[PDB]
Amino acid sequence: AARPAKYSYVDENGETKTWTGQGRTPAVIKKAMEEQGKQLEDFLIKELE
């Protein structure tokens, strides 16, 4: 078994942090959903079946 996260996001220089979908939505993911109209697939790195 493994846990290589589920999503990844940026701040300035490149990829900065990652997330699994557990708990409160990360601030950049939240702002992308609400102020850029995005969905999680823009940040997804593994599987979303």
Protein model, in words:
The protein has 49 residues and is α+β, with helices and mostly antiparallel strands. It has a two-stranded antiparallel sheet with strand order 1-2. It has one domain (7-42): H-NS DNA Binding Protein, CATH 4.10.430.10. A hairpin with a 4-residue loop joins β1 and β2 (15-19). 18% of the residues lie in helices and 18% in strands. It has one helix spanning 27-35, and strands at residues 7-10, 15-19.
Concise summary:
The protein is an alpha+beta fold and 49 residues long. It has one helix at 27-35; strands spanning 7-10, 15-19.
SSE diagram, text form:
Blueprint: E1 7-10, E2 15-19, H1 27-35
Antiparallel strand pairs: 1-2
Total beta strand runs: 2
SSE string, helices as H and strands as E: EEH
Question: Which topology does CATH recognise?
Answer: H-NS DNA Binding Protein
Per the principal axes of the C-alpha atoms, what is the gross shape?
A: globular
Q: Biggest sheet: strands, sense, closure? A: 2 strands, antiparallel
The percentage helix is 10-25%
Subcellular location: Cytoplasm, Nucleoid
Organism: Salmonella typhimurium (strain LT2 / SGSC1412 / ATCC 700720)
Family: Belongs to the histone-like protein H-NS family.
GO biological process, one term: negative regulation of DNA-templated transcription
